[PDB]
Amino acid sequence: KKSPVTLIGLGPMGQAMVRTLLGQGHPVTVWNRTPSRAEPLVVEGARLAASPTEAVASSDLVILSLTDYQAMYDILSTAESALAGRTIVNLSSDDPDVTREAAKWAAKHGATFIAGGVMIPAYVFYSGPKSAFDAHEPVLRHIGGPRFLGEDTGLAQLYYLAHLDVLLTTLASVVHATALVSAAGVDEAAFAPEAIRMVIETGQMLAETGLELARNLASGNHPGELATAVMMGATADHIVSAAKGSGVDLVLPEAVKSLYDRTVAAGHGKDSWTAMYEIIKKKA
Amino acid sequence: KKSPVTLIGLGPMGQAMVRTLLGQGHPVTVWNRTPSRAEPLVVEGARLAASPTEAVASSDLVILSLTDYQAMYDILSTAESALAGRTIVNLSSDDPDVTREAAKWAAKHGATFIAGGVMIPAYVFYSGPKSAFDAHEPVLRHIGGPRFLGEDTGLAQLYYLAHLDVLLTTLASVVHATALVSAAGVDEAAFAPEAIRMVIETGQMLAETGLELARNLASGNHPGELATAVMMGATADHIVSAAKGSGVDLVLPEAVKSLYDRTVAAGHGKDSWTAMYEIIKKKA
Ligand SMILES: [Cl-]
Ligand SMILES: [Cl-]
């Protein structure tokens, strides 16, 4: 009685989504480039499709969890005539303009398209036609906490990549800070927990520095308080010189130094450190 | 009956340290390039020194809280003959090799030298001769939680700058992620709190990903688990292409992409993301 679901892409994320959906009573048809990974899901109740075409034809809702959008094009190439009237929910990560081009390709073949972005703490960003999201939300809510962002298909991966922008850059800074200290002979195991704690401290500081951040970026006014761009720029300069003397790779701290240098050179030296937003943001 | 203290540099940090030390019964002699900032401390009980020489001569312990080490050289230039037999505790931020050169200059003028690094959540890194730290620890503990790091003078600013390496890079990523989303017309006030929450989530993830981080960096083995360098590198590539299409500044995500590119090109693609440490760390 529950609506059938097709899921293509049986990596770790797809495996968990199939198990979840089966436990909620949905018939799940699966397909994967290597059918061996489908075997555990078949014994849990899923049906292995004979081909991508038969997988697509088995449901009105086709969920894709692949490495990138090119994998969607390659897999569904032989199934394009079977896409008419169905909804594609692509949870794969890719460039936002790539996902927008996919919406045009989906419409060419008569399909509705929703882009998704999955965050494992789970919650999923969704973007595309709201009527399509509302039609499949009873199924999508079992995968994780749905957050509809808007009717621009590209939004889900834009938000996802911006979150990963924070994650990947922050993780890189922990590795870089550890190399900086360990260059002096300090045991990595001694300082790495401190660099980790600095992330937590940074988060809690951002839990009046956050009010400074959200207010300044939105209002466009960066009042120089306790932490100005010229003060932070001098610290960034010291980090670079320390890394240059330690023999530690420079590209990451030089990027931070580049942001503060251009922020000071633009006349925002006495303003808050948040004034680097005026250097980073989109022109005009 | 409490030991006298001299403190030079009456910015915000110096103001709080003087008030703290006075409240604990220590006579405090102060000096500043602009004597006006000493007036509030004088009414609290501090004595304004007539000159840097008289400030130095007033105590065996001289604490410096200036913008950089060059300010120490400039201020104490006329007081160099009065430094003999006293301990300089410099809490100013600067390059670690600059602080090591200061230890040589301090010994030239017969003074003991300790470098400090002040973290405002307060706790202070200290480095230099342990006998000097132990001799002044009863006074230093009132300033904040003392953490002796070792007898290399340069350690305190190395640890301090590595902590600030994490802080400044993480803060830059929050501003950059917000610009990435706001380039599409999203209100900054809508996404900036989400970018902030991503820092907190990153910290809590680092509170088995941390065991992965500390173990891999110290042992030098990066077993590829759920998050490999080739997977993270593809996400870094997407962030760059998204920023390149949004018109958002590229230097920060290109630095992260550069780290993953070289990590994959070095044969660590299947290893954990922590394998970028082998690209960042000091040669040999
Ligand atoms: Cl976009
Ligand atoms: Cl060093």
Coordinates of C-alpha atoms and ligand atoms in Angstrom, one line a residue:
Chain A
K1 CA 0.0 0.0 0.0
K2 CA 3.0 2.2 0.5
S3 CA 4.4 3.9 -2.6
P4 CA 7.2 2.2 -4.4
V5 CA 10.7 3.7 -4.5
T6 CA 13.6 3.2 -6.9
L7 CA 17.1 3.9 -5.6
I8 CA 20.2 3.7 -7.8
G9 CA 23.7 3.9 -6.2
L10 CA 24.4 1.4 -3.4
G11 CA 27.3 3.0 -1.6
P12 CA 27.1 3.6 2.2
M13 CA 24.5 6.3 2.0
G14 CA 22.2 4.4 -0.4
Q15 CA 22.5 1.2 1.7
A16 CA 21.2 3.1 4.8
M17 CA 18.4 4.8 2.9
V18 CA 17.2 1.5 1.4
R19 CA 17.2 -0.2 4.8
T20 CA 15.3 2.7 6.3
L21 CA 12.7 2.8 3.5
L22 CA 12.1 -1.0 3.7
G23 CA 11.6 -0.8 7.4
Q24 CA 8.8 1.8 6.8
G25 CA 7.0 -0.6 4.4
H26 CA 8.0 0.9 1.1
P27 CA 8.8 -1.5 -1.8
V28 CA 12.3 -0.6 -2.9
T29 CA 13.8 -1.5 -6.3
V30 CA 17.5 -1.1 -6.5
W31 CA 20.2 -1.0 -9.1
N32 CA 24.0 -0.6 -9.0
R33 CA 26.9 -0.6 -11.4
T34 CA 28.2 -3.6 -9.4
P35 CA 25.2 -5.8 -8.5
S36 CA 27.1 -7.5 -5.7
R37 CA 26.4 -4.6 -3.3
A38 CA 22.7 -5.1 -3.8
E39 CA 22.8 -8.6 -2.3
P40 CA 22.5 -7.5 1.3
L41 CA 19.6 -5.2 0.4
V42 CA 17.8 -8.0 -1.4
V43 CA 17.8 -10.2 1.6
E44 CA 16.4 -7.3 3.6
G45 CA 13.4 -7.1 1.1
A46 CA 14.6 -4.9 -1.8
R47 CA 14.2 -6.1 -5.4
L48 CA 17.2 -6.1 -7.7
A49 CA 16.2 -4.5 -11.0
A50 CA 17.4 -6.2 -14.2
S51 CA 18.6 -3.0 -15.7
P52 CA 18.5 0.8 -15.2
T53 CA 15.5 1.0 -17.5
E54 CA 13.5 -1.5 -15.4
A55 CA 14.6 0.2 -12.2
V56 CA 13.3 3.6 -13.5
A57 CA 10.1 2.0 -14.8
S58 CA 9.4 0.4 -11.3
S59 CA 8.6 3.6 -9.5
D60 CA 7.4 7.2 -9.9
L61 CA 10.3 8.3 -7.6
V62 CA 13.9 7.6 -8.6
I63 CA 16.5 8.5 -6.0
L64 CA 20.1 8.7 -7.2
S65 CA 23.1 8.5 -4.8
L66 CA 26.2 8.4 -7.1
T67 CA 29.7 9.9 -7.1
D68 CA 28.7 12.8 -9.3
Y69 CA 26.1 13.9 -11.9
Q70 CA 28.2 12.4 -14.8
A71 CA 27.4 9.0 -13.2
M72 CA 23.7 9.8 -13.6
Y73 CA 24.1 10.6 -17.3
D74 CA 26.1 7.5 -17.9
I75 CA 23.8 5.1 -16.0
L76 CA 20.5 6.5 -17.2
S77 CA 21.6 7.0 -20.8
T78 CA 19.9 3.7 -21.9
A79 CA 16.8 4.6 -19.8
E80 CA 16.1 8.1 -21.0
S81 CA 12.9 7.1 -22.8
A82 CA 11.6 5.5 -19.6
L83 CA 12.0 8.8 -17.5
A84 CA 8.8 10.4 -18.7
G85 CA 6.3 11.3 -15.9
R86 CA 8.7 10.4 -13.1
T87 CA 10.5 12.4 -10.4
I88 CA 14.3 12.2 -10.2
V89 CA 15.7 13.1 -6.7
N90 CA 19.5 13.3 -7.2
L91 CA 21.4 13.3 -3.8
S92 CA 24.8 13.3 -5.5
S93 CA 27.3 16.1 -4.9
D94 CA 28.4 18.2 -7.8
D95 CA 28.8 21.8 -9.0
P96 CA 25.6 23.8 -8.6
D97 CA 25.5 24.9 -12.3
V98 CA 26.0 21.2 -13.2
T99 CA 22.8 20.4 -11.2
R100 CA 21.0 23.2 -13.0
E101 CA 21.9 21.7 -16.3
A102 CA 20.6 18.4 -15.1
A103 CA 17.2 20.0 -14.5
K104 CA 17.1 21.0 -18.2
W105 CA 18.0 17.5 -19.3
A106 CA 15.3 16.0 -17.0
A107 CA 12.7 18.2 -18.6
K108 CA 13.9 17.3 -22.1
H109 CA 13.0 13.7 -21.2
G110 CA 9.7 14.5 -19.5
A111 CA 10.9 14.1 -15.9
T112 CA 10.6 16.3 -12.8
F113 CA 13.9 17.0 -11.1
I114 CA 14.8 17.7 -7.5
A115 CA 18.4 18.2 -6.3
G116 CA 19.4 17.0 -2.8
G117 CA 22.3 17.6 -0.4
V118 CA 22.8 15.1 2.4
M119 CA 24.4 16.1 5.7
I120 CA 25.5 13.3 8.0
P121 CA 25.5 14.8 11.6
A122 CA 20.7 13.4 9.4
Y123 CA 19.2 16.2 7.3
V124 CA 18.9 16.8 3.6
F125 CA 18.7 20.0 1.6
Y126 CA 16.2 20.0 -1.2
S127 CA 15.7 22.4 -4.1
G128 CA 13.5 22.4 -7.2
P129 CA 9.8 22.7 -7.8
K130 CA 8.0 22.9 -4.5
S131 CA 5.0 20.9 -5.8
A132 CA 7.4 18.0 -6.5
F133 CA 8.9 18.2 -3.1
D134 CA 5.5 18.3 -1.4
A135 CA 4.4 15.3 -3.5
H136 CA 7.3 13.1 -2.4
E137 CA 7.9 14.6 1.1
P138 CA 6.1 11.6 2.9
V139 CA 8.8 9.4 1.4
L140 CA 11.8 11.8 1.7
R141 CA 11.2 12.5 5.4
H142 CA 12.2 8.9 6.2
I143 CA 15.7 9.5 4.7
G144 CA 16.3 12.4 7.0
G145 CA 15.2 15.8 8.1
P146 CA 14.1 17.5 4.9
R147 CA 14.9 21.2 4.4
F148 CA 13.4 22.8 1.3
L149 CA 15.5 25.7 0.3
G150 CA 13.7 27.1 -2.8
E151 CA 12.7 26.4 -6.4
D152 CA 16.2 27.0 -7.9
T153 CA 17.5 23.4 -8.4
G154 CA 21.1 24.6 -7.8
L155 CA 20.4 25.7 -4.2
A156 CA 20.8 22.3 -2.5
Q157 CA 24.3 21.7 -3.7
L158 CA 25.2 25.4 -3.2
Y159 CA 24.2 25.1 0.5
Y160 CA 25.9 21.7 0.7
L161 CA 29.2 22.9 -0.7
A162 CA 29.2 26.0 1.5
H163 CA 28.8 23.8 4.5
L164 CA 31.6 21.6 3.2
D165 CA 33.6 24.8 2.5
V166 CA 33.6 25.4 6.3
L167 CA 34.3 21.7 7.1
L168 CA 37.1 21.1 4.7
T169 CA 38.9 24.5 5.4
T170 CA 38.6 24.1 9.2
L171 CA 39.9 20.5 9.0
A172 CA 42.8 21.7 6.9
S173 CA 43.7 24.3 9.5
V174 CA 43.8 21.7 12.2
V175 CA 46.3 19.6 10.2
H176 CA 48.3 22.7 9.3
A177 CA 48.5 24.0 12.9
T178 CA 49.6 20.6 14.0
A179 CA 52.4 20.5 11.4
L180 CA 53.4 24.0 12.5
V181 CA 54.0 22.9 16.1
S182 CA 55.4 19.5 15.3
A183 CA 58.0 21.1 13.0
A184 CA 59.8 22.0 16.3
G185 CA 59.9 18.4 17.4
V186 CA 56.6 18.4 19.4
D187 CA 54.8 15.1 19.3
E188 CA 51.7 15.3 17.0
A189 CA 49.7 13.4 19.6
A190 CA 50.4 16.3 22.1
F191 CA 49.2 19.2 20.0
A192 CA 46.5 17.7 17.7
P193 CA 44.0 17.5 20.6
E194 CA 44.7 21.2 21.3
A195 CA 44.1 22.2 17.7
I196 CA 40.8 20.2 17.8
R197 CA 39.8 22.1 21.0
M198 CA 40.5 25.3 19.2
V199 CA 37.8 24.5 16.7
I200 CA 35.3 23.9 19.6
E201 CA 36.4 27.2 21.2
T202 CA 36.0 29.0 17.9
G203 CA 32.5 27.5 17.6
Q204 CA 31.5 28.6 21.1
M205 CA 33.0 32.1 20.5
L206 CA 30.7 32.1 17.5
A207 CA 27.7 31.0 19.7
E208 CA 28.9 38.2 20.4
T209 CA 31.4 37.3 17.7
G210 CA 28.5 35.6 15.9
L211 CA 26.2 38.5 16.3
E212 CA 29.0 40.5 15.0
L213 CA 29.4 38.1 12.0
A214 CA 25.7 37.8 11.1
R215 CA 24.9 41.5 11.6
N216 CA 28.0 42.8 9.8
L217 CA 27.7 40.5 6.7
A218 CA 23.9 41.2 6.3
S219 CA 24.0 45.0 7.0
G220 CA 27.3 45.6 5.2
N221 CA 28.6 47.6 8.1
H222 CA 31.8 46.3 9.9
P223 CA 32.3 48.4 13.0
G224 CA 35.8 47.8 14.3
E225 CA 35.5 46.5 17.9
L226 CA 37.9 44.3 19.8
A227 CA 39.2 42.6 16.6
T228 CA 40.1 44.7 13.6
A229 CA 41.3 43.6 10.2
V230 CA 44.7 45.3 10.7
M231 CA 45.2 43.4 14.0
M232 CA 44.2 40.1 12.5
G233 CA 46.3 40.8 9.4
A234 CA 49.4 41.1 11.6
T235 CA 48.6 37.7 13.2
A236 CA 48.1 36.2 9.7
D237 CA 51.5 37.7 8.7
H238 CA 53.1 36.1 11.8
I239 CA 51.5 32.7 11.0
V240 CA 53.0 32.9 7.5
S241 CA 56.5 33.8 8.7
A242 CA 56.3 31.1 11.3
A243 CA 55.3 28.5 8.7
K244 CA 58.0 29.9 6.3
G245 CA 60.6 29.4 9.0
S246 CA 59.3 26.0 10.1
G247 CA 59.4 24.6 6.5
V248 CA 55.6 24.1 6.6
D249 CA 53.5 24.4 3.5
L250 CA 52.4 28.0 2.9
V251 CA 49.4 27.9 0.6
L252 CA 46.7 27.9 3.4
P253 CA 48.1 30.7 5.6
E254 CA 49.1 32.7 2.6
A255 CA 45.4 32.6 1.5
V256 CA 44.3 34.0 4.9
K257 CA 47.1 36.6 4.7
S258 CA 45.9 37.4 1.1
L259 CA 42.4 38.1 2.4
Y260 CA 43.6 40.4 5.2
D261 CA 46.1 42.2 3.0
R262 CA 43.5 43.1 0.4
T263 CA 41.0 44.0 3.2
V264 CA 43.5 46.4 4.7
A265 CA 44.6 47.7 1.3
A266 CA 40.9 48.5 0.5
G267 CA 40.8 50.9 3.5
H268 CA 39.0 48.6 6.0
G269 CA 42.0 48.2 8.3
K270 CA 40.3 49.8 11.2
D271 CA 37.0 47.9 10.6
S272 CA 36.1 44.6 12.0
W273 CA 37.8 41.4 10.7
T274 CA 34.4 40.7 9.0
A275 CA 35.2 43.4 6.5
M276 CA 37.0 40.7 4.4
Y277 CA 33.5 39.8 3.2
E278 CA 33.7 42.9 1.0
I279 CA 36.8 41.4 -0.7
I280 CA 35.3 37.9 -1.0
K281 CA 31.7 38.7 -2.0
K282 CA 30.3 38.8 -5.5
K283 CA 31.0 42.0 -7.5
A284 CA 28.3 44.6 -8.0
Chain B
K1 CA 54.7 42.4 51.4
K2 CA 53.7 41.1 48.0
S3 CA 56.3 41.3 45.3
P4 CA 56.3 44.4 43.1
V5 CA 55.4 44.1 39.4
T6 CA 56.1 46.4 36.4
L7 CA 53.8 46.2 33.4
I8 CA 54.4 48.2 30.2
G9 CA 51.7 48.4 27.5
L10 CA 48.3 49.5 28.7
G11 CA 46.0 48.2 26.0
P12 CA 42.9 46.1 26.9
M13 CA 45.0 43.1 28.0
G14 CA 47.4 45.1 30.2
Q15 CA 44.5 47.0 31.8
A16 CA 42.9 43.8 33.0
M17 CA 46.2 42.3 34.2
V18 CA 47.0 45.4 36.2
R19 CA 43.5 45.5 37.8
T20 CA 43.9 41.8 38.7
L21 CA 47.3 42.1 40.2
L22 CA 46.4 45.2 42.2
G23 CA 43.4 43.3 43.6
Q24 CA 45.8 40.6 44.8
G25 CA 47.9 43.1 46.8
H26 CA 50.8 43.5 44.4
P27 CA 52.3 47.0 43.9
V28 CA 52.1 47.6 40.2
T29 CA 54.2 50.2 38.4
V30 CA 53.0 51.0 34.9
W31 CA 54.2 52.8 31.8
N32 CA 52.7 53.4 28.4
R33 CA 53.6 55.3 25.2
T34 CA 50.5 57.4 25.8
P35 CA 50.3 58.1 29.6
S36 CA 46.6 58.9 29.4
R37 CA 45.6 55.3 29.4
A38 CA 47.5 54.9 32.8
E39 CA 45.1 57.3 34.6
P40 CA 42.3 54.7 35.3
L41 CA 45.0 52.3 36.6
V42 CA 46.5 55.0 38.9
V43 CA 43.2 55.7 40.6
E44 CA 43.0 51.9 41.1
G45 CA 46.3 51.9 43.0
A46 CA 49.0 51.6 40.3
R47 CA 52.0 54.0 40.2
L48 CA 52.8 55.7 36.9
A49 CA 56.5 55.5 36.2
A50 CA 58.3 58.6 35.1
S51 CA 60.1 56.8 32.3
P52 CA 60.7 53.3 30.9
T53 CA 64.0 53.2 32.9
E54 CA 62.2 53.9 36.2
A55 CA 59.5 51.4 35.3
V56 CA 62.1 48.7 34.8
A57 CA 64.1 49.7 37.9
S58 CA 60.9 49.5 40.0
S59 CA 60.6 45.7 39.9
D60 CA 62.4 42.4 39.3
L61 CA 59.5 41.3 37.0
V62 CA 58.8 43.3 33.9
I63 CA 55.7 42.2 31.9
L64 CA 55.3 43.6 28.4
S65 CA 52.0 43.6 26.5
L66 CA 52.7 45.5 23.3
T67 CA 51.7 45.2 19.6
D68 CA 54.9 43.4 18.7
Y69 CA 58.5 42.8 19.8
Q70 CA 59.7 45.8 17.9
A71 CA 57.7 47.9 20.3
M72 CA 59.8 46.3 23.1
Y73 CA 63.1 47.2 21.5
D74 CA 61.9 50.8 20.8
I75 CA 60.5 51.4 24.3
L76 CA 63.3 49.7 26.3
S77 CA 66.1 51.2 24.2
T78 CA 66.8 53.9 26.7
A79 CA 66.4 51.4 29.6
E80 CA 68.8 48.7 28.5
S81 CA 71.4 49.4 31.2
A82 CA 68.7 49.0 33.8
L83 CA 67.6 45.5 32.7
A84 CA 70.4 43.6 34.5
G85 CA 69.2 41.1 37.0
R86 CA 65.5 41.3 36.1
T87 CA 63.1 39.0 34.3
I88 CA 61.3 40.1 31.2
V89 CA 58.0 38.3 30.5
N90 CA 56.9 39.4 27.0
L91 CA 53.2 38.5 26.3
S92 CA 53.3 40.3 22.9
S93 CA 52.6 38.3 19.7
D94 CA 55.3 38.0 17.1
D95 CA 57.1 35.5 14.9
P96 CA 58.7 32.7 17.0
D97 CA 62.2 33.2 15.6
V98 CA 61.8 36.9 16.5
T99 CA 61.1 35.9 20.1
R100 CA 64.1 33.7 20.1
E101 CA 66.3 36.6 19.0
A102 CA 64.8 38.6 21.9
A103 CA 66.1 36.0 24.3
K104 CA 69.6 36.6 23.0
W105 CA 69.2 40.4 23.3
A106 CA 67.9 40.0 26.9
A107 CA 71.0 38.0 27.9
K108 CA 73.2 40.6 26.3
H109 CA 71.8 43.1 28.8
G110 CA 71.9 40.7 31.7
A111 CA 68.2 39.9 31.8
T112 CA 66.2 36.7 32.0
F113 CA 63.6 36.3 29.3
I114 CA 60.3 34.4 29.2
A115 CA 57.9 34.5 26.2
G116 CA 54.2 34.3 26.8
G117 CA 51.1 33.7 24.6
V118 CA 47.7 34.9 26.0
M119 CA 44.5 33.1 25.0
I120 CA 41.2 34.8 25.9
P121 CA 38.6 32.1 26.1
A122 CA 42.0 32.8 30.4
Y123 CA 45.2 30.8 30.0
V124 CA 48.7 31.8 29.0
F125 CA 51.4 29.7 27.3
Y126 CA 54.9 30.3 28.8
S127 CA 58.3 29.2 27.4
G128 CA 61.9 29.8 28.4
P129 CA 64.0 28.8 31.4
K130 CA 61.9 26.7 33.8
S131 CA 63.7 28.1 36.9
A132 CA 62.6 31.6 35.8
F133 CA 59.0 30.5 35.3
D134 CA 58.9 28.8 38.7
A135 CA 60.4 31.9 40.3
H136 CA 57.6 34.1 39.0
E137 CA 54.7 31.6 38.8
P138 CA 53.0 32.9 42.0
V139 CA 52.5 36.2 40.2
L140 CA 51.9 34.8 36.8
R141 CA 49.0 32.6 38.0
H142 CA 46.9 35.6 38.8
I143 CA 47.0 36.8 35.1
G144 CA 45.5 33.5 34.0
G145 CA 46.1 29.7 33.8
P146 CA 49.8 29.2 33.2
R147 CA 50.9 26.5 30.8
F148 CA 54.6 26.0 30.7
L149 CA 55.6 24.4 27.4
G150 CA 59.4 24.1 27.5
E151 CA 62.7 25.8 27.7
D152 CA 62.7 27.0 24.0
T153 CA 61.7 30.6 24.2
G154 CA 60.0 30.4 20.8
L155 CA 57.5 27.7 21.9
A156 CA 54.9 30.1 23.4
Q157 CA 54.3 32.1 20.2
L158 CA 54.6 29.0 18.1
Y159 CA 51.7 27.4 20.1
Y160 CA 49.8 30.7 20.2
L161 CA 50.1 31.3 16.4
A162 CA 49.1 27.6 15.7
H163 CA 45.9 28.2 17.8
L164 CA 45.3 31.4 15.8
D165 CA 46.0 29.5 12.6
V166 CA 42.9 27.4 13.4
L167 CA 40.9 30.4 14.5
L168 CA 41.7 32.8 11.6
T169 CA 41.3 30.1 8.9
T170 CA 38.1 28.8 10.4
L171 CA 36.6 32.3 10.6
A172 CA 37.7 33.0 7.0
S173 CA 35.8 29.9 5.9
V174 CA 32.6 31.1 7.6
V175 CA 32.8 34.4 5.7
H176 CA 33.7 32.6 2.5
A177 CA 30.8 30.1 2.8
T178 CA 28.4 32.9 3.5
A179 CA 29.5 34.8 0.4
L180 CA 29.1 31.7 -1.7
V181 CA 25.5 31.3 -0.7
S182 CA 24.7 35.0 -0.7
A183 CA 26.0 35.3 -4.3
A184 CA 22.7 33.6 -5.3
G185 CA 20.7 36.3 -3.6
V186 CA 20.2 34.6 -0.3
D187 CA 20.1 36.9 2.7
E188 CA 23.4 36.8 4.6
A189 CA 21.5 36.8 7.9
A190 CA 19.8 33.5 6.7
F191 CA 23.0 31.5 6.0
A192 CA 25.6 33.0 8.4
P193 CA 24.1 31.3 11.4
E194 CA 24.2 28.0 9.5
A195 CA 27.9 28.5 8.6
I196 CA 28.5 29.1 12.3
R197 CA 26.6 26.0 13.2
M198 CA 28.9 24.1 10.8
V199 CA 31.9 25.1 12.9
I200 CA 30.2 23.7 16.0
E201 CA 29.3 20.5 14.2
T202 CA 32.9 20.2 12.9
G203 CA 34.1 20.6 16.5
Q204 CA 31.8 17.9 17.8
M205 CA 32.7 15.5 14.9
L206 CA 36.3 16.1 16.1
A207 CA 35.2 15.3 19.7
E208 CA 36.2 9.1 16.0
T209 CA 37.3 11.7 13.4
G210 CA 39.5 13.2 16.1
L211 CA 40.9 9.8 17.1
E212 CA 41.5 9.4 13.4
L213 CA 43.2 12.8 13.3
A214 CA 45.5 12.5 16.4
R215 CA 46.4 8.8 15.7
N216 CA 47.1 9.3 12.0
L217 CA 49.3 12.5 12.4
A218 CA 51.3 11.0 15.2
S219 CA 51.7 7.4 13.8
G220 CA 52.2 8.6 10.2
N221 CA 49.7 6.0 9.0
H222 CA 46.5 7.3 7.3
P223 CA 44.1 4.4 6.8
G224 CA 41.4 5.3 4.3
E225 CA 38.1 4.9 6.1
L226 CA 34.8 6.7 5.4
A227 CA 36.6 9.9 4.1
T228 CA 39.4 9.5 1.7
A229 CA 41.6 12.2 0.1
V230 CA 40.2 11.5 -3.4
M231 CA 36.7 12.0 -2.1
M232 CA 37.5 15.2 -0.3
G233 CA 39.5 16.4 -3.2
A234 CA 36.5 16.1 -5.5
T235 CA 34.4 18.1 -3.0
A236 CA 37.2 20.8 -2.8
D237 CA 37.1 20.9 -6.6
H238 CA 33.3 21.5 -6.6
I239 CA 33.7 24.3 -4.0
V240 CA 36.2 26.0 -6.3
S241 CA 34.0 25.6 -9.4
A242 CA 31.0 26.9 -7.4
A243 CA 33.0 29.9 -6.2
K244 CA 34.4 30.5 -9.7
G245 CA 30.8 30.5 -11.0
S246 CA 29.5 32.6 -8.2
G247 CA 32.1 35.3 -8.7
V248 CA 33.4 34.7 -5.2
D249 CA 37.1 35.1 -4.3
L250 CA 39.0 31.9 -5.0
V251 CA 42.3 32.1 -2.9
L252 CA 40.9 30.2 0.1
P253 CA 39.2 27.2 -1.6
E254 CA 42.0 27.0 -4.1
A255 CA 44.4 26.5 -1.2
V256 CA 42.3 23.6 0.1
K257 CA 42.1 22.3 -3.4
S258 CA 45.9 22.6 -3.8
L259 CA 46.4 20.5 -0.6
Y260 CA 44.1 17.7 -1.8
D261 CA 45.5 17.8 -5.4
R262 CA 49.1 17.4 -4.1
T263 CA 47.9 14.7 -1.6
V264 CA 46.3 12.7 -4.4
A265 CA 49.2 13.3 -6.8
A266 CA 51.6 11.9 -4.1
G267 CA 49.8 8.5 -4.2
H268 CA 47.6 9.0 -1.1
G269 CA 44.3 9.2 -2.9
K270 CA 42.9 6.1 -1.3
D271 CA 44.2 7.1 2.2
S272 CA 42.4 9.2 4.7
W273 CA 42.0 12.9 4.3
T274 CA 44.6 13.3 7.1
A275 CA 47.2 12.2 4.6
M276 CA 47.5 15.9 3.5
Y277 CA 49.8 16.2 6.6
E278 CA 52.5 14.4 4.6
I279 CA 52.3 17.3 2.1
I280 CA 52.1 20.0 4.7
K281 CA 54.7 18.8 7.3
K282 CA 58.4 19.8 7.5
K283 CA 60.6 18.0 5.0
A284 CA 63.0 15.2 6.2
Ligands
CL1 CL 25.0 29.0 -7.8
CL2 CL 59.6 27.7 15.6

